[PDB]
Amino acid sequence: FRKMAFPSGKVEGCMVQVTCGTTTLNGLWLDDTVYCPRHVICMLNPNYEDLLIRKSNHSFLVQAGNVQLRVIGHSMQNCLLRLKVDTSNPKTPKYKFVRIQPGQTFSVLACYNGSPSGVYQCAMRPNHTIKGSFLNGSCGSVGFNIDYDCVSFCYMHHMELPTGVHAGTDLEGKFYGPFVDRQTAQAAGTDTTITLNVLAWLYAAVINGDRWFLNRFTTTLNDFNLVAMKYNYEPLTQDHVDILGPLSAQTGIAVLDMCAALKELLQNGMNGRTILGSTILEDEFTPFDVVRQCS
Amino acid sequence: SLSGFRKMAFPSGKVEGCMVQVTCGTTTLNGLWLDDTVYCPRHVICTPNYEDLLIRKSNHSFLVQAGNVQLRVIGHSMQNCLLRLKVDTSNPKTPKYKFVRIQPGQTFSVLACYNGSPSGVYQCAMRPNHTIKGSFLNGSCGSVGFNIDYDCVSFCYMHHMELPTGVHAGTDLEGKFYGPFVDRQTAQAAGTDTTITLNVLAWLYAAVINGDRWFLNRFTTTLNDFNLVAMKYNYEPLTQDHVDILGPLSAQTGIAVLDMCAALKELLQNGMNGRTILGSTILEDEFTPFDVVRQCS
Numbered sequence: 203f204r205k206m207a208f209p210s211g212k213v214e215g216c217m218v219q220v221t222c223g224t225t226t227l228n229g230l231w232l233d234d235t236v237y238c239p240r241h242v243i244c245m246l247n248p249n250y251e252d253l254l255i256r257k258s259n260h261s262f263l264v265q266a267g268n269v270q271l272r273v274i275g276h277s278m279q280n281c282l283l284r285l286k287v288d289t290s291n292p293k294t295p296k297y298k299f300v301r302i303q304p305g306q307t308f309s310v311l312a313c314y315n316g317s318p319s320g321v322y323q324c325a326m327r328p329n330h331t332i333k334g335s336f337l338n339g340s341c342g343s344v345g346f347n348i349d350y351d352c353v354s355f356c357y358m359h360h361m362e363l364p365t366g367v368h369a370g371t372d373l374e375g376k377f378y379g380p381f382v383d384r385q386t387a388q389a390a391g392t393d394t395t396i397t398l399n400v401l402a403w404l405y406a407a408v409i410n411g412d413r414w415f416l417n418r419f420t421t422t423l424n425d426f427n428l429v430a431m432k433y434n435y436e437p438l439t440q441d442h443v444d445i446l447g448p449l450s451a452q453t454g455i456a457v458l459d460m461c462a463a464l465k466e467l468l469q470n471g472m473n474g475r476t477i478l479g480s481t482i483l484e485d486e487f488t489p490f491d492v493v494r495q496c497s
Numbered sequence: 498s499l500s501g502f503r504k505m506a507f508p509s510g511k512v513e514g515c516m517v518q519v520t521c522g523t524t525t526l527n528g529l530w531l532d533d534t535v536y537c538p539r540h541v542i543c544t545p546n547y548e549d550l551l552i553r554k555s556n557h558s559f560l561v562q563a564g565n566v567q568l569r570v571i572g573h574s575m576q577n578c579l580l581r582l583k584v585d586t587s588n589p590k591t592p593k594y595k596f597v598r599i600q601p602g603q604t605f606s607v608l609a610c611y612n613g614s615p616s617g618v619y620q621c622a623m624r625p626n627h628t629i630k631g632s633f634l635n636g637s638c639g640s641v642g643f644n645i646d647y648d649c650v651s652f653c654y655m656h657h658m659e660l661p662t663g664v665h666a667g668t669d670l671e672g673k674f675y676g677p678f679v680d681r682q683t684a685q686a687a688g689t690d691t692t693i694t695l696n697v698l699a700w701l702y703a704a705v706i707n708g709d710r711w712f713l714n715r716f717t718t719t720l721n722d723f724n725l726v727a728m729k730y731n732y733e734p735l736t737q738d739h740v741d742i743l744g745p746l747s748a749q750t751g752i753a754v755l756d757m758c759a760a761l762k763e764l765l766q767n768g769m770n771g772r773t774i775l776g777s778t779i780l781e782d783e784f785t786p787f788d789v790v791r792q793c794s
Contacts, residue, residue, distance in 0.1 A: 204632040206617035209608060211510025311508065314794075320505035321618060333776075335503040337794050366500030410663065479630070481779055495617075495632055 203406055203478045205486060206495060207309035207323040208302040208348040209419040215293030218271065219316025220285070220342070226312045228342030229285070230262065230358070232294045232372075236264055236271070237373060238342045239360050239383065242276055246385050254278055265316060266291075280375030281360065281383050297353040299373035304328045305396045305436070308345040308356050309487050315339055325486040326357075328380025328436055329393040331367040334359075340477040344373075363390050363480045394436040398445065401438075401460055405449040406492045407477045415477060416455070419462040426461040433468045445489050452497075498707040501776030502700075502784065502792055504607050504620040506606035507645040514590030517568065518613025519582070519639065520560040527610045528561065528582070529655070529670075531591050535561055535568065535582040536670060537639050539658050540680050543716045551575055562613060563588075563666035569718040577672030578657065578680050592650045599653040601625050602693040604732075604785050605642040607654065610761030612636050622783040623654075623732055627676025628664035628689040631656070641670075692732040693782040695739045698757055700782070702746035703789040712774060713752070723758040730765045742786055766788055 220229040222240045229238035243253050243261075259273040262285055275286030276407050302308065307325045311318055313333065317405050323344070336343070336359060345357030359370040360383055369381045381388055387480075404415070427437050438461070446457045464483075472481065519528040519537045524544060528537035542550050542558075554573070559582055561568040572583030599605060601623050609632060611618045621629045621642070633640060633656055641655030656667040657680055664687050666678040678685055706709065724734045740754045747754050761780075769778060784792070 204619040204621070204630075205504070206609065206619045206632060207506060209509040209513050209615040209618050211508075211513040211615075214508050214510040310504065318508035318510075321508055321790075322503040322505045322620075324503070333501060335499060335501070335505065335792060337499075366498075495634070497634075 203403070203410065203484075203487070203495065205323045207321045208346065210309065210318065210321040212295040212343065212348065212353050213311045213346055215251055216291060216295070217311065217313050217316055217318055218264055218266045219421045221265075222257070222261055223385075227339070230342070230344055230355070231264075231266065231271070231287070231291045234240070234290045234295060236273075236287055237282050237358070238285070239358065240281050240283045240375070241341070241360065241383050242283065248384050250278060254283075258471060258487030259459055267316075281371050281377060282358070282373070295353045296351055297355060300347075300354045300356045301372040301374070301376070302326060302356045303489070304330060305398060306356075307486060307491055308347050310334060310345045310359075311343060312336065312340055313343045323486070325396065325399070325485065326369075326378065327393050328396065329391040330377075330381075331363060331369055331390050331393070334368045336362060336368055339377075345370075363388070363391050380469045381467075394434050395437045395483070396486075397430060397436045398442045398489065399485040399487055400483050401446055401457070401464060401485050402449065402489040402492045403462060403478070404460055405446070405453055405455070405489075406487065406496060408453045408455060409449075409492075409496045412413055412477065415467055415472075416459075416463050417466050419466070420456070421462040421465060422456050423458065423461070426458070426465055429465045430468060435468075448493060449489055498709075499775075499793070500707075502703065502781070504783065505792060506618045506620045507643065509606065509608045509618040511648070511650050512608045512641065512643055513541070513615045515588060515592070516608065516610050516613055516615055516641075517563045519560055520562075521558050524647075525612050526636065527613055529639070529640075529641055529652070529700065530563060530584070530588045531570070531594060533584055533587045535570075535584055536655070537582070538668075538680065539580045539672070540638070540657065541580060545681055547570065547575060547695050551580075554693040555601045564613075571579065574773050578668050578674060579655070579670075579672030593648060594650045594652060596655050597651045598669045598673075599642075599675070601627065602695055602785065604783060604788055605644050605653050607631055607640060607656070609633060609637055609640040610640045620783070622693060622696070623675065624664070624690050624787075625693060626688045627678075628666055628687045628690075629654070631665045633659060633665055642667075660685065662687055663698060690732070692780075694727055694735050695742060696782045696785055697732070697780050698735075698739075698743055698754065698761065699746060699786040699789045700775065700784050701757055701761060702743070702750060702752070702779070702786075703793065705750050705752065705785065706746075706789075706793055707775060709775050712760045712764055712770065713756075714760055714763065717755045717761045718762060719751065720755065720758070723762055725758075726762045726765060732765070740751065746786055746789065775794050
């Protein structure tokens, strides 16, 4: 089972570079607008309204490849800037902006000075951070999902946290998690394992012909949680159970029977065995990802 | 420093613009459209003796579609295990490209496609046993693997089939299989696989570059003594050529390769004691020396 990303071509044709002062980062160019982190206009104590009113259109240099786009308008929306440009992007895909929930997955097109370098698939952690791979220059890189040619943009990268994970906003500029765009002492909160995803991934393992970790027990939802919550697992709800419906129907293993398998895995370990080649329980595939990569 | 690595694929857009659907009878799969040629598995003509099966086929036998666009086939020939279909339209999205034959251990990105439509991209390595551990569903035959170097796409893999263990086999872009496999159903099986020692060393170097260095020690080993241990843990033998490939990582860190081998030998014998190296609890073997630089830039 491979952690697959969505093909990045539709997003690559939207990436541009935005410079203000000596500060450069990425922006997303859709139609006649460029979106980028507002910190492109910047310390420990920024007042963005006060920093922005001091700028004009010609304060911003926007480049698509080696070609300048003229800024003819700007506004700030939460933690993003929206720059109106004189050129409309002919390669703008059909798109939406979406704010995803913790536990959901997405592809990141990692970019440096407006040029795409790599693509990877990740999950938003329950604490709203992402375990990515961002180097100096990657702010403004975006995450997305693709559904029948429509790009749903869900993430724009803003900052690195002390524990070496990442934080960002949705494409309305609102941070995921309790984070702010300045250099404060701010830290990643407590995190949990994404239970729903682990169960999805155990279903993937059954669908791909592996059954070793099954057992003869069932469990109630309550009794499952009492165990799994001891292992730093997210509480599982009836809604999460319901979501596992298609996978359960497809394999013939009732969701609560799979929970009983998981309980035994947590309590007894894997004991030198692997699942889908992994020595550890994987939590970055949603039920939707499994259906995409299985069916 | 980086706390961990992701397996990162190349941006796929240059390759997406080259994917088409090829249909011949009831068989449909993916092709690669570069200039006025479409390259696809020769087994598109099948539901043995391809030479003969292909005499029974004409240009009109082949339906080629690039999204909604019909590309009329105006010539066909077989090259090893590929069909080359000349079409009426040179692909306007052809990137700068090369065809290269990948070596065992090396990595590349795969753009998984379904009936001509790109569905996902992931990074994989050519295993020592000449198979890849991929994700290819119904309709993914013809998907391609590649690397990109300064906007030149080097194609190295085309997917042909899945083996009984669930691993995958394919050819280079001249149609010559990787490993002993054939494009026909036989009892063919993947040979036992080994861990890619070169890449494991590379990723130990990446760990050090990123400040994770608890596993280092003040001792060295000979190549032979390391190989006795490695081989006992089902690792590939390290050759002098491999030692030279690690030269740039070794120079940067001032850690001699055989000194890193000494670190690795202790890790294999003693395990990791529950610690992580670059955020992994296992020794990773799908990042090459080149991949390490790329992720560290």
